[model samples]
Target: AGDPFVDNGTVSSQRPLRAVPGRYPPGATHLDAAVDTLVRCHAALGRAPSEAEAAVCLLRRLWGRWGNTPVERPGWRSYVAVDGSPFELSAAWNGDGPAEVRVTVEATADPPTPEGNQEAGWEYLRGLSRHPGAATARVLALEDLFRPQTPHDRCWIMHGMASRPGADPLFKVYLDPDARGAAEAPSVLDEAMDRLGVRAAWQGLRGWLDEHGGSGRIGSLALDLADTDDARVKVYVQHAGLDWADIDRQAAVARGHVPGAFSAALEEITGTEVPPHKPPVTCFAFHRGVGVPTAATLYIPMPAGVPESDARRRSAAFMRRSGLDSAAYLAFLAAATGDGEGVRALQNFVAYRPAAPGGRPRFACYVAPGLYRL
Candidate 1:
């Protein structure tokens, strides 16, 4: 009971997710099946059986390391004050091959003051470097951005495993772009980018933000310091409160062309062609660092309140419609859903990018295991 992983653990029968209200959490058995799907994905991607097992084990251990932290609870639940979960499970796929699975967690003492939040996050980051074979000197050196002298709501630790042979897991830290409110987010992030040695990148992102959502519409920012080869900064713009017409226009301009698959996936998840007068529950990630954004990733959150059965059915439909294989996805759904409530561990984000020259568009899904549902 002393260790959070035990009391609020996610791997046992008495897991914290079991106690989450209004949704069915994935029990130990469900997680087992889910883990199998992940490993099988690696095998399909050409990884040896032994290598796939090792990668899966490493991911589970990474999850355990965060679980061992002094968390408020083991499951990812949204608190009234926080309005979001302390953890999120994101699994991404591109039509085929192994889905790039990742998890991000707030490794801080709950209820820390704004300043304390950053301090705890940094201390945790430093601790990770000490782990055997962490290779985090480059990641740890970017202290200026993590501890930027501006307000940030939450600091998260993210680790992920892909199927690439000998490729180190992805590591990143996500900062709250609107921590100081939408109006001040630009300047706050601008200063932080200067500290991160990406001043040019920030300016380009700022220009896009001003062009798309205008003032006070920024969403989130992440510094992907997984390794130098993949090192870059990403900025996401808030699109809540905008109508579909405006959303389409802005997105078209940003991506050079908005494929029909974007709208089709949107309809499949939200069950509507209209934006619903609310933020599309969406945002656009401008991938950039050296100069302007090279690529953009769009995120559309799955609509809430759908029964798990309906959610799975719709997700499968979307997959088929988008030219993706639905077998693995259905397997994932079986483990993440429960009777009467189909949306539990199934709530997810549908993500995609514009088609590359002579290639079909790229798509991925980001799901949150109903550890804590709002």
Candidate 2:
């Protein structure tokens, strides 16, 4: 059997990339941390060789291009990074199929201007669309995706890629809902839904939003411009004042569904009972031709306001229960915490998306190195 981690020459190293046989190097750069986490995740999830290499190559290329510039805002915490490596790694499992490795990074620029970032990201998308293997056609039409009238946050343009065996690569873009201000976001999103031909779906969802608390509860908006019909317009809902019951009711009204599977997925990942609190975030995704959001995802942050030991325990349980080898996750935790008492550096979260009609449910775990406490 071949090793997925440190296998490709692009990111592979001569020296051991680990502290020990099954532990992460405590002294590693943000790039190094991301590489370690991806390598481990790819190996554990049995990612295909070519797919893994492609993903690793993309990450290295991104790091080389815009990874050095630290984009600072007025706040103490940056929404993207600590070491200027604005990358987040994810391991995804859909039913009994092979696990997939996905990577997301803010489309940053060298000089780090808003326009510069947008141009850089747009160029990347253009290059990808030009690839012969690219099947997603919507990306070719940037006008349909990016609106001139909408106010986009300077620092929030993002690009993401997901890979698995026997499937075309899926590309994603994330934009700010409150780019100008939360109040103005509704109209921007309304225009976006019309452009995407999902205006009816957005109308119903917006009605629900108004009934609940209006655009003040809105979060980020995302688009998955894949080749398949699975390409969805995703709108994130912040559960600032909503309870679990409120969330369940919203799901019931939107997708004719409930959030029971979220708790079940949490229990499976944690190997313990779920808490009685509300999830911090909810994302409703509208597919074209659907009357409402056909899919929903709930994010559960781990190691949140808990001790390092408890966080590790929950993470280990997730690895085992999700049928992933525990060595990689544990090693990454060691590296992230530096044998310390807190897990601030490990921004870990587990998410669940319920099954579509005649489809299987999906679960994913996200690890954001060096992005902590926000």
Candidate 3:
């Protein structure tokens, strides 16, 4: 008959056991010395002390009570009995606490084929790495379930890394007794690769980069084309009732110039035929400040090949035909360039103004200068 309690006629062993422990004799001589030392220390302190001091005091008491025990004692192992059954020589702590010492008992079967235990062990180890608390419970559960098998006896002895919280995914498991004899049992590296799927892990990480838009490193240039000191140009025109100084001030704030660059750019772009002294065809302003200006100067280029004489004549004729005297002309320019808030407000006002049935003024053909601040 196959014996269920032994493996190959040898009972499997656990960590180790002790027997016939020492017994303390009452009122022993050394015990008296220990008590005296404790009393002297307490008397010096003169009052209840901290946990550390209390620990020392307790140790002194314990030493006094048991320091004189003899290792070899008559009937010392028979101090405790249960139902007439003598206590096992291997039991720990003398069975006297709220929780008794626990010893893991080995399985009797040839430690089931190492393959199954290895698989289950690795699964448990992986769980432990991912979730420590769960892993501990799981390993204990597996040990309890497989402890009755033979070849699986030492399965629980395999140790691996303690679990920690993080994103790194690696795990290891020990093989069972039956599988341990094989030369090619799975290596720790093999188990780790199997659990994490090396190639898949890398590819998954790459996919994350693609989906999230690699960094955010491209867009507008930081260079400013308008940052030059001499880059600004200003011009002024005197008209009948128009306050050129006030217009100059507003234009200075709007275009960052005491007198703005629009008129100069237009003069250069269109040739000098559009004189500043002539009822200004269009007004311009510029200012200096941090960041892009809220306004900018617009310089209308001269129509290509238009003779200066013809351009001046055309400009004067247009001004006359419109019956726009100095006052009305300045009023128009003021309405447009009078505010530093930007030309949009003025433009909006002009846009909504009542037009003679001629379907709004043909003044749209006039070149309005661009104005902007630093």
Candidate 4:
């Protein structure tokens, strides 16, 4: 015969483990009980209720009466229909004003009761009235709400209702994994500023003006610089919208940071410095049909000992990754064609390069403003 307690392996004669049979209580196993209650209540109220009302009534009957005890579903809040319609509670409010109804239930101490499990469901139905036309509001399991994308807005609403004045419930809702893609704002702004050239050139130009102490006149400089005989200067001034004197004034200010740095850097790379009568040539081609100017500046300094080929390769890679090449090409085509027709021409420019061995080296091309017509 097995020892009463020591049969398993223990020295004590008491049984440490015992098999306990469990099942839903009488009249509790029927899944349709909650649904039937809701239907009957809705009919008694004499209104064709929406899904939210049905869900809320079912929840109140199933869970809401239990007092503060470890009810079977301690955090089990509510049930919601997964339908895609917005939350509508026309049946609950008599179409005139909101209603306030409190529910109570009891729970047995043994296996836990399903009494408070419906709080979330009732709260959700209330939410339907609060936020009408919201896409799909239903009683949600509090555990399910904590999973993800369980709108914190809804959580706050539930918290306000559940926790009363000076009767603080020692429970809080939380999101498992918080929102994604929060770091994208600054990145987006930087990209927009760079593409517009308003921020890039404006900073340098502003600094130059501040040092020189004179009002920077944009329109007059372009006209005066265009009168020069040098083809490069004329082209640059026309494109850049600045003249020789303006360039001198701006460069004078830029020299404070590094003496003769701007002129020397330009000559070292491009074999020429911007003339005193012309602005630096940094115009990018804007796509036609797009009602905006697109341009870029060569801001990176190329020092001695850096191989030109390597420099070009690095620049190409940067442009490709930054989406600048496509933008510049589109800008150029747009500016070239006087009308919006140049926008369509960008489709033919196969500028996108696949990252692989023996691929085409990225090349920079320019189209003169209004060149599409010429």
TM-score of decoy 2:
0.73
Winning model by TM-score: 2
Give the per-residue lDDT digits (tens) of candidate 4, residues 94-187: 1122211111121221222122222343344344344322212211322232222422211111111111112211111111111112233223
Task: Note each model's CA RMSD in angstroms.
Answer: 7.1, 9.0, 42.1, 32.5
What shift in Å separates residue 134 of candidate 3 from its native position after superposition? 2.9
> Which runs of model 4 end up more than 4 angstroms from their true locations?
1-210, 213-261, 268-278, 281-365, 368-374
**Each prediction's TM-score against the native?**
0.70, 0.73, 0.16, 0.16
lDDT of 2 at 7: 18
Ranked by lDDT, the better of candidates 2 and 4 is: 2
List the global CA lDDT of all models.
Answer: 0.50, 0.56, 0.25, 0.26
Cα lDDT tens digits for candidate 3, 106-155? 11111223344334433433434444322233233234222333433223
Candidate 1 backbone clash number: 9
Residue 365 alpha-carbon offset, candidate 4, angstroms: 5.3
Question: Which numbered prediction scores highest in lDDT against the true structure?
Answer: 2
Candidate 3 has a TM-score of 0.16
